[PDB]
Write a protein that binds this DNA or RNA. Structure first.
Lengths: 48, 49, 417
DNA sequence: AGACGGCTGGCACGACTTTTGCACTCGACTAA
DNA sequence: GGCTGATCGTGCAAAAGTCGTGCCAGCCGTCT
């Protein structure tokens, strides 16, 4: 029920098909935050 | 491009664990960027492009 | 001395040449002039939130994508459907060809049968006839959507099949001769076919306002018309007072010379801009004086106007008038029209009248609109209307005006009442 | 079923418009 | 020489385009 665009349609199709399985993805608000931090002279990145 | 995994490659993510943060470097900033802005213009009202 | 018209004597040259700055000023560039001024001000150093729209309208592209996701299809089938959705026109038709789609697929296993199956599935969508790229195909799908209980269904299908040409030319007699259909019973089927919602994908498009910024505004409230330019749109430049107060105090000859040159250039540019603004205001006032007669006479009875006639109303050369008229727009209570739209050719009329081409076209369009649908007005018949107007005109050349108004041929405009 | 009839439509010559491509030599001297 | 600098500078004209209006060749709708 959040900004995960790829997750919303997936969950809707799952409910239509009665899957009831949750696929996380990763919220776009975090992407916005990362871009905003990078807009400053600040280095930030997500490792593995 | 066979276009079947091309769409699939769009939906991908890393572990993203143990994120850190530190100071930046200008060459790194240029790496982040793809181009440089050089005019204060934002949008045209003649063609809306 | 004496008054005379002898034609042999000495003289001097004409107006002095190479007035490039004045030539640019005479031409109106609107925002382009603003951009040039910004560039010059960059060259000249002595011159001077929480609320967001947040709208995610589907535009029927997202609706189509959701339908594709909600529909059961193979991975190849899903990819083909996505590719088909990519090549969809705003009106609801497919921009690319089926062979073009197959080529874009670039798969040997991909076949025309699969493309046809996808199109049928594509046809199997709301609205019907999606990306049909063929009016008959979309019409056929829409007809197939409805039930067969409706009367004149098979006849309508037959007409849509291969009788489109007669309807295009409105060839009712030829269509009756060919299809051997019931006379005047086909009118109901024709009306039903007219009730087929052509371009069903047009509903996807949403209206977007056209931001038109006028230059001159006219009110004429209680008479007393007064032309006023858009003060907000009026450019304004400022002199750098801090830079101005540092020229004499400079102890360096190079710096002082540079400051003096920049000040002279800025003064010349400001003078040119002010002169251009004043000339534009004077031209607007003269036009409004001319347009007041046109505005009172109305669009139908608009008087003819000449470029030389307006240049006479002003003191500048007609070249300046032509340059100023370029990229010129103004706002009036009746509406907003280009300055050049005022000028029109003068058509010799009965009693010696000179008839504006635009006004003549408007009157002809009004007359043609008020015509019998069963019998469209003929171009030769338009001569009778022109004679009724009491003003001579060129009926032979009136077809050019009719085509200019995008008026279809009268024979082609014929339709059943 | 072939011919009148008005349309249609381009082509032509006048008749109005039009854009751009145009800066001397000063009054300082400038003397070899 | 080599242009070299500078009051002061609100067309114009000339070849080019573009339209006005008429003028002829074809075409189909038709009824003799």
């Amino acid at each position: 029920k959040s900004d995960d665009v790829n997750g919303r349609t997936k969950m809707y199709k799952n409910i239509v098909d009665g899957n009831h399985q949750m696929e996380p993805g990763m919220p776009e608000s975090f992407n916005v935050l990362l871009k905003e931090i990078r807009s400053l002279g600040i280095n930030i990145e997500l490792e593995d | 491009k066979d276009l079947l995994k091309f769409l699939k490659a769009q939906t991908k993510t890393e572990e993203f664990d143990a994120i850190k943060i530190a100071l930046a470097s200008p060459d790194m900033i240029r790496s982040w960027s793809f181009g440089e802005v050089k005019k204060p213009e934002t949008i045209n009202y003649r063609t809306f492009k | 001395m004496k008054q005379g018209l002898q034609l042999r004597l000495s003289q001097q040259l004409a107006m002095t040449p190479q007035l490039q700055q004045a030539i640019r000023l005479l031409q109106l560039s609107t925002l382009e002039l603003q951009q040039e001024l910004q560039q010059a001000l960059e060259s000249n150093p002595l011159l001077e939130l929480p609320v967001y729209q947040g709208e995610t309208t589907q535009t029927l592209q997202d609706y189509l994508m959701w339908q594709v996701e909600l529909t059961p299809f193979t991975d190849t089938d899903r990819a083909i459907a996505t590719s088909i959705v990519d090549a969809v026109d705003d009106t609801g038709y497919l921009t690319i060809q089926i062979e073009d789609i197959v080529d874009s697929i670039g798969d040997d296993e991909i076949g025309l049968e699969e493309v046809e199956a996808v199109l049928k599935r594509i046809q199997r969508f709301d609205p019907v006839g999606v990306a049909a790229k063929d009016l008959r195909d979309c019409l056929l799908i829409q007809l197939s959507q409805f039930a067969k209980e409706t009367p004149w269904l098979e006849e309508a299908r037959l007409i849509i099949s291969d009788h489109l040409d007669l309807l295009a030319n409105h060839d009712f007699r030829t269509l009756m001769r060919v299809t051997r259909l019931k006379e005047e019973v086909l009118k109901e089927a024709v009306n039903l076919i007219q009730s087929l919602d052509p371009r069903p994908g047009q509903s996807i498009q949403t209206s977007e306002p056209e931001y038109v910024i006028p230059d001159v505004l006219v009110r004429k409230v209680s008479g007393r018309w007064t032309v006023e330019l858009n003060a907000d749109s009026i450019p304004r430049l400022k002199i750098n007072q801090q830079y101005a107060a540092m020229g004499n105090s400079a102890r360096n000859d190079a710096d002082g010379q540079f400051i003096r040159s920049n000040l002279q250039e800025a003064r010349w540019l400001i003078k040119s801009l002010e002169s251009r603004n004043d000339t534009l205001l004077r031209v607007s006032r003269c036009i409004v004086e001319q347009q007041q007669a046109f505005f009172e006479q109305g669009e139908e009875y608009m008087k003819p106007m000449v470029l030389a006639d307006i240049a006479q109303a002003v003191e500048m050369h007609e070249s300046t008038i032509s340059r100023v008229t370029t990229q010129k727009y103004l706002h009036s209570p009746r509406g907003i029209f280009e300055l050049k739209y005022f000028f029109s050719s003068h058509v010799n009329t009965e009693g010696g009248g000179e008839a504006s081409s635009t006004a003549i076209r408007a009157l002809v369009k009004k007359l043609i609109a008020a015509e019998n649908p069963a019998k469209p007005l003929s171009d030769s018949k338009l001569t009778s209307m022109l004679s009724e107007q009491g003003i001579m005109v060129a009926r032979r050349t009136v077809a050019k005006y009719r085509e200019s108004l995008s008026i279809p041929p009268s024979n082609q405009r014929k339709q059943l009442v």
